[PDB]
Amino acid sequence: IKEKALEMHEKNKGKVGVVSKVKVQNLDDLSLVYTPGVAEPCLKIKENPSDVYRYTMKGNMVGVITNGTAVLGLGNIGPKASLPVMEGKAILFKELAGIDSFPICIDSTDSQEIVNIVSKISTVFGAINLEDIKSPQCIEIEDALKAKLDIPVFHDDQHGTAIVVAAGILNALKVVKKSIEDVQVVINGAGSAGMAIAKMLLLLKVNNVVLVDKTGTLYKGVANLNEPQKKLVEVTNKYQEKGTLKEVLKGKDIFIGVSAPGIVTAEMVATMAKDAIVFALANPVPEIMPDEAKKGGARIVATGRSDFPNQVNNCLAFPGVFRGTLDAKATQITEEMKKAATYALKNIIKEQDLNENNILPTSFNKEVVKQIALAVCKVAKETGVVR
Amino acid sequence: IKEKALEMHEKNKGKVGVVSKVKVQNLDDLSLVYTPGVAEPCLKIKENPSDVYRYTMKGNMVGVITNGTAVLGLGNIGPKASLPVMEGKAILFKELAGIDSFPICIDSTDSQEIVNIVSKISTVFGAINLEDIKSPQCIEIEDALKAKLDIPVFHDDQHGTAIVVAAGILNALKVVKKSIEDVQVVINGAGSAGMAIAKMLLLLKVNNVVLVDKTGTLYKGVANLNEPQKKLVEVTNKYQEKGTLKEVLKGKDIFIGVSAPGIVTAEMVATMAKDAIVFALANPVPEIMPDEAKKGGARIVATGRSDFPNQVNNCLAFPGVFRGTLDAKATQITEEMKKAATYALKNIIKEQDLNENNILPTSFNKEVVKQIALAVCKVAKETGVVR
Ligand SMILES: NC(=O)c1ccc[n+]([C@@H]2O[C@H](COP(=O)([O-])OP(=O)(O)OC[C@H]3O[C@@H](n4cnc5c(N)ncnc54)[C@H](O)[C@@H]3O)[C@@H](O)[C@H]2O)c1
Ligand SMILES: NC(=O)c1ccc[n+]([C@@H]2O[C@H](COP(=O)([O-])OP(=O)(O)OC[C@H]3O[C@@H](n4cnc5c(N)ncnc54)[C@H](O)[C@@H]3O)[C@@H](O)[C@H]2O)c1
Ligand SMILES: [Mg+2]
Ligand SMILES: [Mg+2]
């Protein structure tokens, strides 16, 4: 309900407050939380610069940095209007994985300016969560900061998406008894989230993925790919298929839509392979209803909806992703760490309890952050990507 | 004690944590602190951009922004090493004036870069507290951001200093029965804090102030003034005196030192006017001890020391300054608002209870933030500098 939301925000002027982690009411402790006390850790950090991580909030602090240019489904609406979302993201870090988070909203659509600016304010952050930025812009920024900064940088709306998606896919294949190295996938929308699902599947040795945009699939020599679309045309659609979604969906095991509402029909689901897997994650109106999906013959349907039986939820991955990432002092959130965050999530469900309505856990299950963290941590230490 | 400080910081990995201002454990409230709830204030702010201030932390949030280039008496030691100080400053905003504060430490010594960068991250802050930056650099940045941003910007180490100083001066004059429009002041150190005390006194119609640096006083045609020193040479030292501190101190009513340790003697205090006022605020070793100050003949001595009878303390002004500033929705922290913050502070002491050891209140007295706020607020509304 609208009014219920608005009231909530108005109620306390925001969701995000700061507390003191130590106590101070007099002059004694004052000279320790401030001068001349504060001088002593400052000189420590000056001597050994890594000592930031023991006299400071840094190592439990994740920055939630944004642009405003892609806010939920509201798109480019600016830094002010995105603020409530960023505040909301911060307190979820806090409530789900006991993480201190703070929102920074940046007023610039220039990649290089945003890169530089975030890189210059990294002192206080133990990790960066990038949120609600425009594809393709979000990629170069993520990539630029990732090779620039010595702390973990992570675009949740694309990499966090793929973790839950790949989790739900792996679980769904066990159901219909198929293996992901044998199956032909179609992803509608070559934007941020489409892009990254493609990556996380190729990361999983998918047999073949085809990306489709609002104009047709993407193949070598397509008119106008953005720079990341181009790099992805190389790895995807091996058999070099061309044409519209209607034509291309024909014969596929998995449809994954992150694009639009109601662009897929029941007829279209009938053309897909037996035991079809349909993921209609467009929001709020998915590209097809599970009703019309099961009518076409879909064995499994996931959506981005809470009311519907199989919810792809972003709060499944990011709290546990950052938890182990921080818990490990990881300098980086690598691909293998993503890969490990997927399996851990897919394994909350026992394998004895898998259904066509039990491919993903509940988004609040405390055992999700715990296991995703342990696996994200376990590989960080192993691989070396650790302070 | 050192170890006691270091332990304190280590104890909890920093002084600054974040809380949620609203509750959320399930899915119900989740869809209000996040999607689809957060959409509703976001669209409000998009429609009326001022609505930031009712669905968001902004209007109770002050940013503590720094460089590292002037940390206490540690000077240029970088963004990492300054972090504990900035964290300490944030929780004092919180504990003294119930204000949410967050530390941003900037890794750049380029004025224009720092201006731009802070201006670009202003979305989340209701006010800016600039902290621990190099004179003269701090001035152009303060000035640039002050004319650029629509929120209050405030360099505490200079303007906050002057408020307490001017407060202690006005109170001290009542003691020795002198008026500030008749008296001849000398300030040692034409750095940030010296500079700004000069301003706040000229703001008070001082008869004559003389600034002195590590090389001699400042007069028209002095070899190498920085740009702000130059502007101040015009308003100060009317009688155009030249020479060293020894020579120049001779005959003055007030000495105010913000420079060095032990550069003033008892002999030198004997040359000043009757009922001398001596302010040795250099830290930790003041430019003269009260013992040697009263030996020279000082009627009144203030220092920056807690053990000594008259402490100039920065935590006297800034919590109450920002309180009323925020309490008023001030768009600006103007000169008249500074002026009003001074008088309010000087008037915590009854005027029936003034001593040579009672010119300033206690730095924890809750009635200080309250009154400084009401006066800072009262003039904001009057003058118009208000949303
Ligand atoms: N957990 C989840 O449920 C979850 C996570 C991420 C995204 N999503 C949903 O997926 C959708 C995409 O989100 P995003 O972050 O990738 O946004 P995005 O704008 O980056 O992706 C959209 C892309 O799809 C393409 N597209 C648009 N309309 C199309 C059409 N009719 N046919 C084919 N292609 C089309 C466009 O090229 C665009 O670049 C959103 O509606 C969002 O709600 C859901
Ligand atoms: N509330 C307080 O007690 C309070 C507040 C602010 C500053 N201070 C003290 O005052 C001092 C100055 O602080 P600041 O922020 O202005 O630092 P600053 O470096 O900006 O000011 C120092 C300036 O004094 C000049 N100087 C240095 N040594 C000198 C000497 N021997 N003779 C004459 N001039 C000299 C230099 O030109 C320099 O620019 C510090 O030691 C600080 O502890 C105290
Ligand atoms: Mg988002
Ligand atoms: Mg300071």
| Cβ of A301 less than 6 Å from ligand 1 | no
B188 is in an annotated binding site: no
Q: How far is the CA of B194 from the centre of ligand 2 (A)?
A: 7
Experimental method: X-ray
Instruction: Quote the tokens at residue B303.
Output: 């220092």
Q: Could you tell me which residues come within 8 angstroms of residue B124 by beta carbon, excluding any fewer than 6 positions away?
A: A83, A103, A104, A105, B57, B58, B61, B63, B102
Which of B35, B56, B120 comes nearest A106 by C-beta?
B120
Q: B174 with B27, same domain? A: no
B132 is in an annotated binding site: yes
Q: B25 with B115, same domain? A: yes
> Which of these three, B95, B127, B155, is where a domain ends?
B155
Task: Supply the CATH number for residue B95's domain.
Answer: 3.40.50.10380
Q: Which residue has the tokens 């006297």?
A: B316
Residue B18 bridge partners (DSSP): A18
Please answer yes or no on whether A57 and B17 come within 8 Å at the CB atom: yes
Q: How far is the CA of B87 from the centre of ligand 3 (A)?
A: 28
Chain A hits for B39, Cβ within 8 Å = 5, 72-74
Sheet holding B100-105, edge to edge: B100-105, B61-66, B127-131, B153-155
Sheet holding A184-188, edge to edge: A216-217, A208-213, A184-188, A254-257, A276-280, A298-303
The radius of gyration computed from the CA coordinates of chain B, to the nearest angstrom, equals 22
Shortest Cα–Cα distance, B203 to chain A (Å): 29
Positive or negative: CA dihedral A167, A173, A174, A176 = positive
- Tell me the C-alpha distance between B119 and B142, whole Å: 11
Instruction: Quote the tokens at residue A234.
Output: 């190389």
Q: B109 with B185, same domain? A: no
- Tell me the C-alpha distance between A130 and A66, whole Å: 6
Q: Could you tell me which residues come within 8 angstroms of residue B368 by beta carbon, excluding any fewer than 6 positions away?
A: B316, B319, B320, B345, B348, B361
- Chain centroid to Cα B166, Å, comes to 12
Evaluate whether B250 touches B272 at the Cβ level (below 8 Å). Answer: yes
**Catalytic site positions of A:** 34, 89
**Number of structural domains chain B divides into:** 2
Host domain of residue A229: 156-387
Among the residues of chain B, which ranges form H helices?
2-12, 30-33, 39-47, 52-55, 78-97, 111-120, 137-148, 161-175, 192-202, 227-235, 245-249, 266-271, 290-296, 318-327, 335-346, 366-383
Q: Which of B34, B80, B148, B246 is catalytic?
A: B34
CA A361, A159, A181: angle at the middle one, nearest 5? Answer: 75
Which of B40, B72, B121 comes nearest A35 by C-beta?
B72
Please answer yes or no on whether B89 and A306 come within 8 Å at the CB atom: no
- Tell me the C-alpha distance between A31 and B88, whole Å: 10
Please answer yes or no on whether B120 and A124 come within 8 Å at the CB atom: no
Please answer yes or no on whether B56 and A84 come within 8 Å at the CB atom: yes
> Which of these three, B155, B185, B203, is where a domain ends?
B155
**Helices B335-346 + B366-383 axis angle, to 10:** 150
Q: Could you tell me which residues come within 8 angstroms of residue B340 by beta carbon, excluding any fewer than 6 positions away?
A: B375, B376, B378, B379
Q: A24 with A54, same domain? A: yes
3-state secondary structure string, A248-291? HHCCCCEEEECCCCCCCCHHHHHHCCCCEEEEECCCCCCCCCHH
Torsion of CA A350, A353, A357, A360, to 10 degrees: -10
| Element at B16 (helix H, strand E) | strand B16-20
Q: Which amino acid would we find at residue B158?
A: Q
- Tell me the C-alpha distance between B5 and A29, whole Å: 9
Q: B139 with B167, same domain? A: no
| Cβ of A226 less than 6 Å from ligand 1 | no
Helix (H, G, I), strand (E, B), or coil: what is residue B279?
strand
Q: How far is the CA of B282 from the centre of ligand 2 (A)?
A: 6
Q: Which amino acid would we find at residue B310?
A: N
In eight-state DSSP terms, residue B311 is: B
| Cβ of B263 less than 6 Å from ligand 2 | yes
Instruction: Quote the tokens at residue B66.
Output: 């720094």
- Tell me the C-alpha distance between A202 and A102, whole Å: 33
> Which of these three, B97, B130, B155, is where a domain ends?
B155
C-alpha distances (whole Å) from A150 to each of A128, A147, A332, B86 are 11, 8, 7, 22
Q: B182 with B82, same domain? A: no
Which of A42, A94, A108 comes nearest B71 by C-beta?
A42
Q: B170 with B315, same domain? A: yes
Residues within 5 Å of ion ligand 3, judged at the Cβ atom: A 131-132, 157
- Tell me the C-alpha distance between B65 and B154, whole Å: 10
Question: How do the residues of chain A divide into helix, strand and coil, expressed in percent and rounded to 5?
Answer: 45, 15, 40
Please answer yes or no on whether B102 and A18 come within 8 Å at the CB atom: yes
Q: B195 with B64, same domain? A: no
The radius of gyration computed from the CA coordinates of chain A, to the nearest angstrom, equals 22
Phi, psi of B71 (to 5 degrees): -95, 110
Shortest Cα–Cα distance, A35 to chain B (Å): 8
Between β-strands B16-20 and A16-20, what pairing exists: parallel, antiparallel or unpaired? Answer: antiparallel
Evaluate whether B133 touches B66 at the Cβ level (below 8 Å). Answer: yes
Phi, psi of B72 (to 5 degrees): 45, -120
For ligand 2, atom 39: residue with the closest CA: B191
CA A285, A289, A294: angle at the middle one, nearest 5? Answer: 165
Q: Count, in order, helices (H) and strands (E) of chain B.
A: 16, 11
Positive or negative: CA dihedral A189, A190, A193, A195 = positive
B314 is in an annotated binding site: yes
Q: In this structure, how many other beta carbons lie within 10 angstroms of the beta carbon of residue B23?
A: 11
Q: A86 with A160, same domain? A: no
Q: Closest chain B residue to A283 measured between Cα atoms?
A: B36
In eight-state DSSP terms, residue B160 is: I
Q: How far is the CA of A131 from the centre of ligand 3 (A)?
A: 5
Query: What's the resolution in A?
Result: 2.5
Phi-psi region of B189 (alpha: psi -120 to 50; beta: other; left: phi over 0): left
Per DSSP (E only), the strands in chain A are 16-20, 61-66, 100-105, 127-131, 153-155, 184-188, 208-213, 216-217, 254-257, 276-280, 298-303
- DSSP string of A193-220, one letter each residue: HHHHHHHHHHTTT-SEEEEEETTEE--T
Sheet holding A127-131, edge to edge: A100-105, A61-66, A127-131, A153-155
| Cβ of B354 less than 6 Å from ligand 2 | no
Q: Is the peptide bond before A136 cis (omega within 30 degrees of 0)?
A: yes
Q: B62 with B178, same domain? A: no
Q: In this structure, how many other beta carbons lie within 10 angstroms of the beta carbon of residue B151?
A: 21
Task: Supply the CATH number for residue B374's domain.
Answer: 3.40.50.720
Active site residue B53: no
C-alpha distances (whole Å) from A377 to each of A90, A152, A374 are 21, 13, 5
- Tell me the C-alpha distance between B356 and B192, whole Å: 28
Q: Which amino acid would we find at residue B230?
A: K
- Give the ligand whose atoms come closest to the C-alpha of residue B248: 2
Q: Which residue has the tokens 């599947």?
A: A201
Evaluate whether A86 touches B93 at the Cβ level (below 8 Å). Answer: no
Q: A81 with A168, same domain? A: no
Instruction: Quote the tokens at residue B30.
Output: 């989740």
| Cβ of A157 less than 6 Å from ligand 1 | yes
HSE of B269, CA atoms in CB hemisphere, 13 A: 28
Which of B9, B26, B94 comes nearest A55 by C-beta?
B9
Q: Among A24, A97, A110, A28, which residue's Cα sits nearest to residue A62?
A: A97
Helix (H, G, I), strand (E, B), or coil: what is residue B355?
coil
Q: Could you tell me which residues come within 8 angstroms of residue A3 by beta carbon, excluding any fewer than 6 positions away?
A: none
Instruction: Quote the tokens at residue B14.
Output: 């920093």
Q: B103 with B188, same domain? A: no
| Element at A89 (helix H, strand E) | helix A78-97
Evaluate whether A299 touches A254 at the Cβ level (below 8 Å). Answer: no
